[PDB]
Amino acid sequence: GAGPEMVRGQVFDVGPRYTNLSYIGEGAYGMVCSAYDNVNKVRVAIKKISPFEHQTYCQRTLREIKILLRFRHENIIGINDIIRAPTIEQMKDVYIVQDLMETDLYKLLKTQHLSNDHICYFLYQILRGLKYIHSANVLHRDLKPSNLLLNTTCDLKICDFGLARVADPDHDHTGFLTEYVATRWYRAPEIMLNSKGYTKSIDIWSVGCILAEMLSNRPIFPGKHYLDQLNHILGILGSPSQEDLNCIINLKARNYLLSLPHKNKVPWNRLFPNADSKALDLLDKMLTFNPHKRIEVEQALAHPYLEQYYDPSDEPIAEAPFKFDMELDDLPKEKLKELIFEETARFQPG
Numbered sequence: 286g287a288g289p290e291m292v293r294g295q296v297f298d299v300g301p302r303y304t305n306l307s308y309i310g311e312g313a314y315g316m317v318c319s320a321y322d323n324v325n326k327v328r329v330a331i332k333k334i335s336p337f338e339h340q341t342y343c344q345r346t347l348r349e350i351k352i353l354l355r356f357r358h359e360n361i362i363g364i365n366d367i368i369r370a371p372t373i374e375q376m377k378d379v380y381i382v383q384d385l386m387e388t389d390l391y392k393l394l395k396t397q398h399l400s401n402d403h404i405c406y407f408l409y410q411i412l413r414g415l416k417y418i419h420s421a422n423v424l425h426r427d428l429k430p431s432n433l434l435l436n437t438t439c440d441l442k443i444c445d446f447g448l449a450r451v452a453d454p455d456h457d458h459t460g461f462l463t464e465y466v467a468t469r470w471y472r473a474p475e476i477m478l479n480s481k482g483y484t485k486s487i488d489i490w491s492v493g494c495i496l497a498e499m500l501s502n503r504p505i506f507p508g509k510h511y512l513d514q515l516n517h518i519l520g521i522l523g524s525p526s527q528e529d530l531n532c533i534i535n536l537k538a539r540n541y542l543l544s545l546p547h548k549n550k551v552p553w554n555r556l557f558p559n560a561d562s563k564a565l566d567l568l569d570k571m572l573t574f575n576p577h578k579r580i581e582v583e584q585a586l587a588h589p590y591l592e593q594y595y596d597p598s599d600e601p602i603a604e605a606p607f608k609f610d611m612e613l614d615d616l617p618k619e620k621l622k623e624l625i626f627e628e629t630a631r632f633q634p635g
């Protein structure tokens with residue numbers, strides 16, 4: 286005596302364990318809703334995804350699920366359950382379940398003005414979790430405000446590993462103006478110059494952009510298109526020094542920068558008048574042009590601005606490094622569906 290239940294767009298087949306559905310969001314890659322978790326009496330967040338039609342959609346699903354299930358950390362969202370049909374043939378949509386988190390950084394910065402206390406705390410939690418992911422040789426590659434979940438009690442947890450992958454520094458070099466998929470406003474300068482984003486330094490840059498954005502409730506470098514994003518970065522940072530030209534071997538990247546007029550660095554304090562100086566000093570180190578000089582995660586956690594929370598022994602690392610034997614492109618949608626099936630088998634009764 287009941288029903289399957291539909292939200293707004295379409296049906297949600299997740300009974301009987303979860304009920305009382307409420308629409309939350311939907312942005313291309315699935316619809317997010319809020320359900321009631323019977324058994325473990327607590328509300329939860331559940332996302333319906335129908336990726337099998339598209340290749341791209343299938344990669345995003347596998348990375349997220351394989352990574353999330355493998356990771357175990359307080360500042361990274363975990364997967365409680367995964368619903369889908371008993372066979373590959375009957376599987377069209379997958380439902381992933383996570384603890385319910387009232388909001389995210391993106392939604393919170395639209396109206397609330399974070400105080401220094403809350404900024405410092407949120408930055409710490411961001412870095413604590415990043416230390417764990419980097420320690421497993423993984424790069425999130427798409428850290429942004431909407432990727433950070435927040436409880437009402439301020440516990441912050443990272444969540445979108447759709448474009449995440451295994452480090453791999455040896456193959457980071459690429460040509461000038463190489464296409465990229467991760468969110469524009471958070472891409473480091475080298476992405477547009479000579480990098481594919483295969484090193485840990487790329488997440489740090491994104492984190493710094495999230496620091497700045499927390500400090501003034503608006504994107505630090507809001508580019509409108511590919512090369513405009515680098516124009517925004519260079520606008521504030523100034524012209525890159527000549528003295529240190531670490532990397533940047535391809536002549537096209539070097540020549541482009543070399544053809545810009547000299548532009549001086551806009552001082553941090555000028556952009557953020559009323560803001561702790563220690564926070565600004567870290568911000569500087571996180572947003573340094575040169576990716577080799579850029580500060581790394583553990584080093585960031587040890588910065589004076591974060592001294593109230595810093596404690597190495599309470600900042601766990603992964604028990605074992607992550608291995609992605611699936612390759613970037615190469616892998617048809619069919620096998621991806623199989624891996625997804627296999628990856629999610631543990632949640633089937635048995």
Ligand SMILES: Nc1n[nH]c2nnc(-c3c(-c4ccccc4)nn4ccccc34)cc12
Binds near residue numbers: 330431445
């Ligand atoms: N845990 C959450 N509570 N409320 C939320 N709103 N959006 C998210 C969320 C999910 C998602 C939702 C349910 C299950 C699996 C993935 N995927 N995802 C991808 C990009 C940005 C946010 C986000 C997470 C939560």
